[PDB]
Amino acid sequence: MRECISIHVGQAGVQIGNACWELYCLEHGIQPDGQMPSDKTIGGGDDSFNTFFSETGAGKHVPRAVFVDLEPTVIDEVRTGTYRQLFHPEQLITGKEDAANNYARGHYTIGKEIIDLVLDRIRKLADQCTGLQGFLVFHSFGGGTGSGFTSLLMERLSVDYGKKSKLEFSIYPAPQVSTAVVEPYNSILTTHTTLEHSDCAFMVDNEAIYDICRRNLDIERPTYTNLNRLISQIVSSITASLRFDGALNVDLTEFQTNLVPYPRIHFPLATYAPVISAEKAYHEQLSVAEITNACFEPANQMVKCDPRHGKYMACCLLYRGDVVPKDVNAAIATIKTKRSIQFVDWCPTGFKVGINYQPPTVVPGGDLAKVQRAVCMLSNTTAIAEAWARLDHKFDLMYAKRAFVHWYVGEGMEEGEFSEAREDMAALEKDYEEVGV
Amino acid sequence: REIVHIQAGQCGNQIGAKFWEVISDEHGIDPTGSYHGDSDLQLERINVYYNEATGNKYVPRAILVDLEPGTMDSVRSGPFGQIFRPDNFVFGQSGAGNNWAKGHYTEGAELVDSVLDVVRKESESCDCLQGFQLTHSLGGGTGSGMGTLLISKIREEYPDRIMNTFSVMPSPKVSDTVVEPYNATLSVHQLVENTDETYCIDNEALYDICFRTLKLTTPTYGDLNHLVSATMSGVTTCLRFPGQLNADLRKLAVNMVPFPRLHFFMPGFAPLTSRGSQQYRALTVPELTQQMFDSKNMMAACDPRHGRYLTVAAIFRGRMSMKEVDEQMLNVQNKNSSYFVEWIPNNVKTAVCDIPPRGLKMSATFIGNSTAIQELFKRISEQFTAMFRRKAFLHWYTGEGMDEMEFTEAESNMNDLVSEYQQYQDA
Amino acid sequence: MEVIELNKCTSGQSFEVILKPPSDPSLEEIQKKLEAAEERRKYQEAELLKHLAE
Amino acid sequence: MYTFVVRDENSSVYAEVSRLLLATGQWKRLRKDNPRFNLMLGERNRLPFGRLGHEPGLVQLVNYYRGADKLCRKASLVKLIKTSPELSESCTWFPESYVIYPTDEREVFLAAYNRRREGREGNVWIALISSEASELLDFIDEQGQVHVIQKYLEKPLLLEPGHRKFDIRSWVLVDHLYNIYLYREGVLRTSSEPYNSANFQDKTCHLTNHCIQKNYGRYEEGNEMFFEEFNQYLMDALNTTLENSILLQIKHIIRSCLMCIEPAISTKHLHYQSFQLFGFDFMVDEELKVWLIEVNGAPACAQKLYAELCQGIVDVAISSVFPLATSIFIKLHH
Ligand SMILES: Nc1nc2c(ncn2[C@@H]2O[C@H](COP(=O)(O)OP(=O)(O)OP(=O)(O)O)[C@@H](O)[C@H]2O)c(=O)[nH]1
Ligand SMILES: Nc1ncnc2c1ncn2[C@@H]1O[C@H](COP(=O)(O)OP(=O)(O)CP(=O)(O)O)[C@@H](O)[C@H]1O
Ligand SMILES: Nc1nc2c(ncn2[C@@H]2O[C@H](COP(=O)(O)OP(=O)(O)O)[C@@H](O)[C@H]2O)c(=O)[nH]1
Ligand SMILES: COc1ccc(C=C2c3ccccc3C(=O)c3ccccc32)cc1O
Ligand SMILES: [Ca+2]
Ligand SMILES: [Mg+2]
Numbered sequence A: 001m002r003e004c005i006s007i008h009v010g011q012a013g014v015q016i017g018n019a020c021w022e023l024y025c026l027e028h029g030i031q032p033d034g035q036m037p038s039d040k041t042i043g044g045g046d047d048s049f050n051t052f053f054s055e056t057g058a059g060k061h062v063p064r065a066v067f068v069d070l071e072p073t074v075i076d077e078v079r080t081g082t083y084r085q086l087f088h089p090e091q092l093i094t095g096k097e098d099a100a101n102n103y104a105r106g107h108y109t110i111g112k113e114i115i116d117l118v119l120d121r122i123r124k125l126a127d128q129c130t131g132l133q134g135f136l137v138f139h140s141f142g143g144g145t146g147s148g149f150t151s152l153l154m155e156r157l158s159v160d161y162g163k164k165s166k167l168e169f170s171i172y173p174a175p176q177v178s179t180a181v182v183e184p185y186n187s188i189l190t191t192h193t194t195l196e197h198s199d200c201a202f203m204v205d206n207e208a209i210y211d212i213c214r215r216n217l218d219i220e221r222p223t224y225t226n227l228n229r230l231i232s233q234i235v236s237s238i239t240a241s242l243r244f245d246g247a248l249n250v251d252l253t254e255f256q257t258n259l260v261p262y263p264r265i266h267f268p269l270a271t272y273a274p275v276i277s278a279e280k281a282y283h284e285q286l287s288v289a290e291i292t293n294a295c296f297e298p299a300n301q302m303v304k305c306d307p308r309h310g311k312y313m314a315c316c317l318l319y320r321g322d323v324v325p326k327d328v329n330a331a332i333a334t335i336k337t338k339r340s341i342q343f344v345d346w347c348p349t350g351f352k353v354g355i356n357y358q359p360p361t362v363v364p365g366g367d368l369a370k371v372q373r374a375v376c377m378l379s380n381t382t383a384i385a386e387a388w389a390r391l392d393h394k395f396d397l398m399y400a401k402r403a404f405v406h407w408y409v410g411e412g413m414e415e416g417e418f419s420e421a422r423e424d425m426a427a428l429e430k431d432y433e434e435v436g437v
Numbered sequence B: 001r002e003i004v005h006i007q008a009g010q011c012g013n014q015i016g017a018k019f020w021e022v023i024s025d026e027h028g029i030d031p032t033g034s035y036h037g038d039s040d041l042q043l044e045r046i047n048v049y050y051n052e053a054t055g056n057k058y059v060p061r062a063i064l065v066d067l068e069p070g071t072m073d074s075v076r077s078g079p080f081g082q083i084f085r086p087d088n089f090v091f092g093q094s095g096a097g098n099n100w101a102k103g104h105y106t107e108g109a110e111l112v113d114s115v116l117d118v119v120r121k122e123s124e125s126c127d128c129l130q131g132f133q134l135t136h137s138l139g140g141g142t143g144s145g146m147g148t149l150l151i152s153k154i155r156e157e158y159p160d161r162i163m164n165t166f167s168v169m170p171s172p173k174v175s176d177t178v179v180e181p182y183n184a185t186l187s188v189h190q191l192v193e194n195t196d197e198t199y200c201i202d203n204e205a206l207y208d209i210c211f212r213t214l215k216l217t218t219p220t221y222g223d224l225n226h227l228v229s230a231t232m233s234g235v236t237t238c239l240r241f242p243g244q245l246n247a248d249l250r251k252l253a254v255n256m257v258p259f260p261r262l263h264f265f266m267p268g269f270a271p272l273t274s275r276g277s278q279q280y281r282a283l284t285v286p287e288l289t290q291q292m293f294d295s296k297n298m299m300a301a302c303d304p305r306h307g308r309y310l311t312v313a314a315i316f317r318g319r320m321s322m323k324e325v326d327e328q329m330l331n332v333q334n335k336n337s338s339y340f341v342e343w344i345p346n347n348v349k350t351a352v353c354d355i356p357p358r359g360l361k362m363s364a365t366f367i368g369n370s371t372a373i374q375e376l377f378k379r380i381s382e383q384f385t386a387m388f389r390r391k392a393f394l395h396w397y398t399g400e401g402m403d404e405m406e407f408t409e410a411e412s413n414m415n416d417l418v419s420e421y422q423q424y425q426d427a
Numbered sequence C: 001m002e003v004i005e006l007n008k009c010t011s012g013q014s015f016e017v018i019l020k021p022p023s024d025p026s027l028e029e030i031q032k033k034l035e036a037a038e039e040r041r042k043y044q045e046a047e048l049l050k051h052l053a054e
Numbered sequence D: 001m002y003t004f005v006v007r008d009e010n011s012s013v014y015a016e017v018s019r020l021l022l023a024t025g026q027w028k029r030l031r032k033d034n035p036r037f038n039l040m041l042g043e044r045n046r047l048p049f050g051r052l053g054h055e056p057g058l059v060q061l062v063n064y065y066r067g068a069d070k071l072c073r074k075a076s077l078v079k080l081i082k083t084s085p086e087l088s089e090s091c092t093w094f095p096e097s098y099v100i101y102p103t104d105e106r107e108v109f110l111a112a113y114n115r116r117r118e119g120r121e122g123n124v125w126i127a128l129i130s131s132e133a134s135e136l137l138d139f140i141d142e143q144g145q146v147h148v149i150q151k152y153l154e155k156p157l158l159l160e161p162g163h164r165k166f167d168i169r170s171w172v173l174v175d176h177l178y179n180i181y182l183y184r185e186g187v188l189r190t191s192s193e194p195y196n197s198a199n200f201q202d203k204t205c206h207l208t209n210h211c212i213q214k215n216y217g218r219y220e221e222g223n224e225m226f227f228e229e230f231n232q233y234l235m236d237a238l239n240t241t242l243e244n245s246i247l248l249q250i251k252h253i254i255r256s257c258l259m260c261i262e263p264a265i266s267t268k269h270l271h272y273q274s275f276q277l278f279g280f281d282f283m284v285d286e287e288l289k290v291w292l293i294e295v296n297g298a299p300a301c302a303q304k305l306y307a308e309l310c311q312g313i314v315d316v317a318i319s320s321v322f323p324l325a326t327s328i329f330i331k332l333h334h
């Protein structure tokens, strides 16, 4: 057994972290007070779920997680929330004033006065580990904290934990729920600085999640709660192999091995199905073939793009519920003859499959209905580069006039870092182009 | 994140007193300073503007300043006069005689330290002071002269805090003296350097609204201040109440100000209403959106079609379909996308608050950073030059130690500001 | 077509299907960047206080 | 009030479309880089499909199908036909072709060149037109880019009077629902100079481009015979109709080509939406057997037909998505 530490940075990271750990507790049968009756090894053990939960002699199972925000508002709701007993004070870190949607303010100014504290609180968890794999980092692209402080943290972790892997769960900015006009600046800046330090990053476009909630859950105006409970399901599907018994993606290194052949191109596309409304009176349960086919519909992807006009490098299917290999293979064979699925010439055209017989758990009172079988496809396709193209275009429009730049320069950042970050992104789009066409 | 409020001069104290009167009612706070509401939404972010004393007494974090006691004695004898901390009354006796020099260099310089002692006393109580907001006029002497002196000295002691201002612009339609263009021009020079956000409240606009739209034959300063207090309540809604975006002045500044000098906003409001006259029909969302963008609803007498919007912030109040708000706001942008700059993607943001202002089931407040604001500064510049080319009325200022060069410099900077706005109107 | 590496357990099972075969900065440098940016802030603030002093 | 943008100035077809749209008084043209558009008359190269369908509160449509270039490029069309089971290597309405790269399937091409020579049958091909393989391979390597070698139809149908060669141009509109609409009006781009069977050097009677020809304007105005006249000629000279003898094959070829690539380019469940106007070039041999020559993704129209076709595009491809406040098309059902 090897441990994994989850890091939640900024508002988006924290609130998503709350959704995930809430769901984790329900899947492992852990109560809000940290008690896990099914765990017959009191005070310790090296089970699969111990990857995410450490144990106290009193029989409390606590998340191997740290929450950090440069403002106390969001985390204070974790300190007083329903799962207040779950975490302990040293895990919940808060500053006084936030980064004000400013990357430079989060990275340089305010980041400098709290980074040492954070790493110390992280080190305290790492000391409780017998064999640390690495870290799972949750944050937004748009936030000043989520962008600025994250990149700084990722740099130091590569120094203090050079041999450890580091995965990302990143929220890509969408105007329908954007909080700032400069989020494209922050996105490009944190991506450039974090790129060499991230082994594998799962991007979630709020645009995609917003429309999935509107279209499939019939929620006219999805709240962050609506978005986050859906995201937590996807994140759960991805990390389930680290928390349950299996032979696929059993450690963090295997994620890079199975999904990321080229280091820089480490942004796998996630596609999830089925998403069904809880207040949907009558629903016909979907089959293995139907949910597997839905993995190739852009309307179900975490990022809206067209994989038909790109090339795959890897593709993993992660089923939960009543599913057996026979039906999976039958579904794949059918789909292959109906849909455009081009792999790069230097990769085998195939699928790695993982099945967990326990169907997806739903939060009581949530928006998602219980389903008999669900799937999450992790495909490394060059089509996700469309998101970089969109983002870099918005960056170019503003930076051409140096709009809002003075806010970053005023925090000690150089104007050169803008162009240096943008050049790194220009190279990234090129890398995707070489592989994809 | 606490905000320290300051109100300077006759105009500053009269709109300032009116402002506290309005929001105190919204937060359920009575003239005694005691809460009597029915919603917790009222008290969640009340720390931003109010200090809490023992027995749960709420006292405005407000500092009242003037070079004569006349207007402040009226405030203290006004409806909510008792709510203010009596030590925060800092006043002189000589007055400023509508003279910027007197407020900035002589009469005001003698009093300014006494004010900063009260500012410092308030700030030291703040858990995390985020910034200041000033209410004043630019046409007089105290609010214009001493007000900008205060801003400069506050920018010397708290250089990493946000400075915001509600600045009343002079107009011949509503004029007290002929030297208002001098006082205003000298003040704009200061505001351009030492404020992050300035709400341009044009007395010309406020008059035209009262006359043309509200059909008030002879509008008073009271009528004008009904529009100001309503506007001030709106623009501070997100700072005072729970919502999506979490109440702070820096995030407003970052998102609204693409270039540091271009931070002069056009406020707008809908529906436009007069005092006493109650409206019985609530406006539909399409009506709120249409009106709040109409020039007739702008508090700065500038035509938004003569310029382009750099950024826009809109706050809808009342119980409504936030979906319908989204559609209507997106409709405006998609219908008139030419009046929005294309090099700032998604430069229009909207927020909604359940609590409506008193007397209305719903409302909409507009905060626009338009290049059309140059029309305001050009207007002042023309009036300035008409007198200055003959050095008229200048002896009032040179008598206080000022030189003609300082006028020439102030004139030059405002004309620069104008040309800067013009630069981005043709980008 | 070809199913391989079938691994089964009580919780579930995993395998691989093939349709077709193929054809860092140091702590020093970091502390340097942060402090260098801090100096630029100090310089900017000094220029302001100097300007205000005038 | 809908909005649109224009990013291809050289487009004669859509220069007329943008004109018609504005004339309705319910469409407003925006600047090139204005993202808040309902419609996009995009450029021909590097069209940013990735930036489409991401504007909240805007239904977006573009006048091009992403991936349709696989059909409208000569090198791609051959590969598409040979690899797709729907069309197959055994396809009877496409000439025998091969993909050849400059110094690939060059060895494959020579294997067929031998049967033609060791069969004493017609052995003329086209990239220039020659009966010698060596003369062609030496020409491709001298140009630089990739070329396609194709069997030359040595026995084409010849119009009388004149003994003239010709090709047929059909305009096809595919809307957002992937309905395939065939413009009822086509045109025969004819050669004025009589077809010569022996001398391939003179490429003035072998190639029927409107530019090369411009005996120009002798038989018909501008070397362009429309369907009413061509139909009449077929009736008088061959005792048949355009519909029966040729158009059934044309409709079959069009239908087959577009059905093949439908799953790859369809925008049915996409966040944005596409339509596109195509120009199919057909060739008819003496036995009234139709052959597909190529497909144009950015086709120009005939002067007489601009007004009718362009108006047609607005009706079924644009107004069908953005409605305002008998049909010239033949729906190829599938
Ligand atoms: N999916 C999702 N996105 C969120 C959530 N909260 C914030 N965001 C997104 O995050 C972006 C802004 O970053 P935030 O996380 O809010 O800001 P921050 O990380 O706290 O950084 P600062 O507040 O600027 O110091 C916006 O584009 C939001 O749409 C959330 O709970 N769920
Ligand atoms: N394999 C063949 N057999 C007989 N004629 C052929 C032929 N290949 C091409 N042609 C004759 O080719 C002439 C010109 O070239 P092609 O059809 O490739 O046009 P472009 O000039 O490549 C297409 P367009 O100008 O219509 O966009 C055809 O229109 C026709 O005159
Ligand atoms: N809106 C409004 N403007 C005022 C009021 N009183 C004065 N003004 C304006 O402010 C300018 C005069 O400044 P004033 O405040 O009287 O001078 P001060 O007391 O020395 O600061 C003139 O342009 C007036 O039009 C008021 O009550 N309301
Ligand atoms: C122009 O872009 C933006 C402009 C402003 C903001 C934030 C704000 C804002 C931020 C903090 C406090 C108050 C406000 C507001 O009262 C306001 C009201 C409506 C819409 C946005 C805003 C956010 C943006 O992305
Ligand atoms: Ca245990
Ligand atoms: Mg935050």
Ligand SMILES: [Mg+2]
Residues within 6 Å of the ligand: B010, B011, B140, B176
């Ligand atoms: Mg006065």
